[model samples]
Each structure stands twice: as C-alpha cells, then as structure tokens.
Target: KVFGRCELAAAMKRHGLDNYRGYSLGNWVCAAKFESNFNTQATNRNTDGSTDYGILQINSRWWCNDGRTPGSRNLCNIPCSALLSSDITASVNCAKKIVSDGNGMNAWVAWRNRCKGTDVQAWIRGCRL
Candidate 1:
C-alpha cells in the first residue's frame, strides 16, 4: 500500500511510534523513506536470499518469517506478511522490539547508511508534527 508522507506519519504517531524506543518520529520516517519509501507492501530480496518487508524493511532473517526464507530466527514472532500491511500496528510493534534487541536504529542499514547523524527533520519536512 502507498502512503503520502504526512499521512504515514500521522498513522505511525497514532500507533505510538512517534517516540518509540527513544527514537524520534523523524528517525522512523527517515528509515522508512530509505527502506521502502513508505510503501507498506514493499519487499526486497537481499543478496543472502532473505527478504525485507514493509515500510521499515523488517528482515526475514531475524524479525519475521516469510515462509520462503527457511530457518529464519523470527525474533519478532510475527508473520512477514503482517509487516506488509497498510495497517502499521504490527510493523511498529516489531520495530520497537528490534530496537530493544540492542541494535537500536542500527537494525536498519538505511538508518546507519543514510539517516544517522543527519538532520532527520528533513524526513518530516512538510508535515505538521
């Protein structure tokens, strides 16, 4: 599913992601932008044959089971398809766990590779947060 930037922020805020795991709302927004461009149904096959799912690109290797990627750890205990929905509740909940798992935002390479140490305000630029 596709979401306008501000619309996604509002939904995520309602889901309590605005300050989840001490990561600012803009941080999640930034990660989503680079991870999936806010496309809820997005999926990408990683080089290791694992896939990333949904807006935050939660990985099948550690977070969720896609049924395709065998022997997944599924630390989040959720089906990968749950992450690929327009309703972001499950995705946000799993993201919180991911951060709490000691990775912080570093769980998302996009957050490290592109968003870290940057002025993340730009991700929420046109939104009335």
Candidate 2:
C-alpha cells in the first residue's frame, strides 16, 4: 500500500484525516511521507531493538505488540501486524490516539526530524484535497 502523494492524501481524507481530531492535513501528510512514504507494509528495526511498523511506523516499544519485545505499551490494544495491512483504518485510529497522547506527529521520529516546521504545504502541494 505504498501510495503516491495524491493517492495517500485521498485515502487519508477518506479516513477523515481531512483535519480530523485537531491535526492539520499537512502535518499528517508530512508524517505519512516521512514515516513510510505511505507504505502500509513498512517495518524498521531500531537501534534500541524496537521495531516500527506500518505506514506511520508505529513503534513496538509503546504502540503495538510485535511479540519480540517484552514490554510493549500497546495503547491501541491491537496487534502490530494489524498496522501492516493495506487497509489503514486501524493505522489511522492508532495514529490519532498517538497524537492525542500529546506527541502529535512527533510520535514518528521522522516527523520531528524532517517534517516539523518545514514548508509542509509542499507535501500536498499539487493534490487537490
């Protein structure tokens, strides 16, 4: 489910990401780009021995259960594999919860390191949402 920018934006909007739950679409779109390039199946093993899963790269340490880790917070109460599916319903829900937890898109390191404070309008520049 690695979507093009426009495709990803449309999908996000279909999921109510069009300013849902107080976050801007630009921020979310930027986060999605930096996280996985809208790849629903993305997974990364971190240096801390934690793995990030799915399009938003939700980490095993605090977001989902990857089974290899012993103390995952699992705040979304869903298996990490659920995030890897092409369907982003669970992923979006979990992401919203993550942001609501006060991290915002900062939950994804990519967002903090790359997307924050940049010209985020470019993320969806040509996509007519």
In order of appearance, the predictions have TM-scores of 0.92, 0.91
Distance from true location, Cα of 46 in model 1, Å: 1.5
Computed on alpha carbons, the lDDT of every model, listed in order, comes to 0.88, 0.84
Tell how far residue 72 is off in model 2, in angstroms: 1.8
Name the regions of candidate 1 deviating beyond 4 angstroms: none
Q: Indicate the TM-score of model 2.
A: 0.91
Clash count, one per candidate: 0, 0
Please list the residue runs of candidate 2 whose C-alpha ends up more than 4 Å from where it truly belongs after superposition.
none
Where does the lowest 10-residue lDDT sum fall in candidate 1? 120-129
Q: Model 1 lDDT vs. the true structure?
A: 0.88
